[PDB]
């Protein structure tokens, strides 16, 4: 399947994956990294590369990161730059992770998966508000 790597400031990436697996069961072909104060983008590039070495990246790689412009995002950006089937998507949330992991098994094309991740991530943000009676 298409490889997924999750990166956030701190230690949240591992937990977002754990949460997803609590919902979907253990996942294959997924990696994650942490970012600790004192580290820079170059440290992170190495961390991402070490994770990729263990993943099947033949169909592509989708980096799901916490926020646009942070170190995790900047480092991932440097890796995907002139690579086909490599993308970085900021704002990772559980709806995005769950929908993306579910679709991945039905072997979608890379563009299809990227589009689904952005759409489900955004549609997943919703307020309860008053309900009709």
């Amino acid at each position: 399947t298409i490889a997924i790597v999750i990166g956030t400031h701190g230690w949240a990436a591992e937990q977002l994956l754990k949460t997803a697996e609590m919902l979907l069961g253990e996942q294959e072909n997924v990696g994650w990294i942490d970012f600790v104060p004192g580290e820079n983008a170059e440290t992170l590039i190495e961390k991402y590369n070490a994770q990729l070495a263990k993943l099947d990246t033949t169909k592509g790689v989708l980096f799901l990161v916490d926020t646009w412009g942070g170190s995790p995002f900047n480092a991932a950006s440097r890796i995907v730059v002139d690579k086909e089937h490599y993308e970085v998507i900021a704002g990772v949330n559980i709806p995005m992770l769950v929908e993306t992991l579910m679709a991945r098994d039905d072997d979608p094309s890379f563009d299809e998966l990227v589009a689904l991740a952005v759409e489900t991530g955004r549609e997943g943000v919703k307020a309860l508000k008053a309900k009709p009676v």
Binding site: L23, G25, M102
Partner: protein, 165 residues
Amino acid sequence: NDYMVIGLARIDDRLIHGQVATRWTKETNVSRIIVVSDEVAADTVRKTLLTQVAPPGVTAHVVDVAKMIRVYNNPKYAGERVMLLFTNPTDVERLVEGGVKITSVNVGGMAFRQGKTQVNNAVSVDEKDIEAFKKLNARGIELEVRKVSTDPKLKMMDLISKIDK
């Protein structure tokens, strides 16, 4: 048998929870979902919310056990594949007694509670739930326990056999 076709029977006191209904809907190829519960049917507020969050392309219906037996007695859904959602195995034995045909029952999840015994990570059974499962098994009906189709399938009798003799 020449009437509606039960694509799958999932038991869950939460009905739709997480992507369990979304993933199970696509894998089970289900375009219709019917909820059988008198307590929920009496909650107009909950019915509205469940109907407004019904997955796209999928219709969610809310009916009572007595009304459900009649909907199945109508060939209007013949061949149609529908998923049955229950909150307790007691309501499943009732449909069978009405002449409903069930080949197997899948346990999705059951809120734990005091006085009950935990058989799985989130599945609890009381002397009443166990008694219903034994009757279904005595009828040759298969009972499988699993939270997601990607998780290993376990036999309800095996889990209750290592607890209740």
